[PDB]
Design a protein around this nucleic acid. Structure first.
Ligand SMILES: Nc1ccn([C@H]2CC[C@@H](COP(=O)(O)OP(=O)(O)OP(=O)(O)O)O2)c(=O)n1
Ligand SMILES: [Mg+2]
Ligand SMILES: [Mg+2]
Ligand code: NA
Ligand code: NA
Length: 326
DNA sequence: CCGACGGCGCATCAGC
DNA sequence: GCTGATGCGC
DNA sequence: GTCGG
């Protein structure tokens, strides 16, 4: 907060473009812009001044201006009155529900938490579990709770296989005071860039979190990526914790540093980082960094021994996690 | 003025 | 069934 | 919507 009023607006605008407009570049434009301005250590006084930031542009600057002058932005207000827009916006807040579902659902008359609650049969497993946890999904997990769950997945994993190694990523890793969700990066000897790779691995751990009731519901699950719900065990007579999204990604043991870099994000930060890499003649993914130039065809992965080596290749000072919001 | 925008997992559907 | 696309997601 | 060619 400094320029919260600004970032908010951009955020709203970005939500619009993405849910309603289905103009994903404009969505990306708005968020980068909001993240840069969020790091900005001064209270912006004008658009021009914002313009000096990378990602802030001419339009966004006129807006910031009407904004600073009126405390508002018409276009937002006016969007705010559109009904089709409010439904989509509402619907898209349901996990599993995105731009196209929300429009067909709107088209078919489903448009409120009510319409939804009586039409579970028209949803997919995904959206049904999302409907189910609708407000919980919207709550911030505070840090002390994060410390509790970590402890659990960790302790649980050890139990399945001493060898497994799980690490809590996303906003947590970035030292946040409250996450949004739980992101678990996991590895095991047995599965490497050239392994006879075991689907047993993600499975047995998922299983183990189940039997312990940590894990309550499943959103998706492949042989390397699991996406579901978990929850902390409540004390006698104490009212239970909300349900949380938890993501567990299984990574080749060996491509760990690329793995952790990726899962720690931010998403904006990675977006920015991967881009700079291209610039620099590279192409970074969760597995490897590879040379990629002129012909556009990439080459063999360069060796890496730390997250650091990935910043090195691209000419960037190491940015510890706390510095990853963008 | 204009092409490109990070890179990839899992679910679902149609084509065959 | 498989392959490719599209949705929605991290 | 912006950026960089
Ligand atoms: N479009 C995205 C979204 C996410 N990720 C990466 C960023 C880190 C990891 C975890 O993602 P989230 O849990 O969505 O984000 P977070 O930074 O952990 O934030 P939150 O507190 O909202 O979970 O996935 C990404 O590369 N690209
Ligand atoms: Mg997260
Ligand atoms: Mg997550
Ligand atoms: Na700018
Ligand atoms: Na959604």
């Amino acid at each position: 907060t400094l320029n919260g009023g600004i970032t908010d607006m951009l955020t709203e605008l970005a939500n619009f473009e993405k849910n309603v407009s289905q103009a994903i570049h404009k969505y990306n434009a708005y968020r980068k812009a909001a993240s840069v301005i969020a790091k900005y250590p001064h209270k912006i006084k004008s658009g021009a001044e914002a313009k000096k930031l990378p990602g802030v542009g001419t339009k966004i600057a006129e807006k910031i201006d009407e904004f600073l002058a009126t405390g508002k932005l018409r276009k937002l207000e006016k969007i705010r009155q559109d009904d089709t827009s409010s439904s989509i916006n509402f619907l898209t807040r349901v996990s599993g529900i995105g731009p196209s579902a929300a429009r067909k659902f709107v088209d078919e008359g489903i448009k409120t938490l009510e319409d939804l609650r009586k039409n579970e049969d028209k949803l997919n497993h995904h959206q049904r579990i999302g409907l189910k946890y609708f407000g919980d999904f919207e709550k911030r997990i505070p840090r002390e709770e994060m410390l509790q769950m970590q402890d659990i997945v960790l302790n649980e994993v050890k139990k399945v296989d001493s060898e497994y190694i799980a690490t809590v990523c996303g906003s947590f890793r970035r030292g946040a005071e409250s996450s949004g969700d739980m992101d678990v990066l996991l590895t095991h000897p047995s599965f490497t860039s050239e392994s006879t790779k075991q689907p047993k691995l993600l499975h047995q751990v998922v299983e183990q979190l189940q039997k312990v009731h940590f894990i309550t519901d499943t959103l998706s699950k492949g042989e390397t990526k699991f996406m579901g719900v978990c929850q902390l065990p409540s004390k006698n007579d104490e009212k239970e914790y909300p349900h949380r999204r938890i993501d567990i990604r299984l990574i080749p043991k060996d491509q760990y540093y690329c793995g952790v870099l990726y899962f720690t994000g931010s998403d904006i930060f990675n977006k920015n980082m991967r881009a700079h890499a291209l610039e620099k003649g590279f192409t970074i993914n969760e597995y490897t960094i590879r040379p990629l130039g002129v012909t556009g065809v990439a080459g063999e992965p360069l060796p890496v021994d730390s997250e650091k080596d990935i910043f090195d290749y691209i000419q960037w000072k190491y940015r510890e996690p706390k510095d990853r919001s963008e």
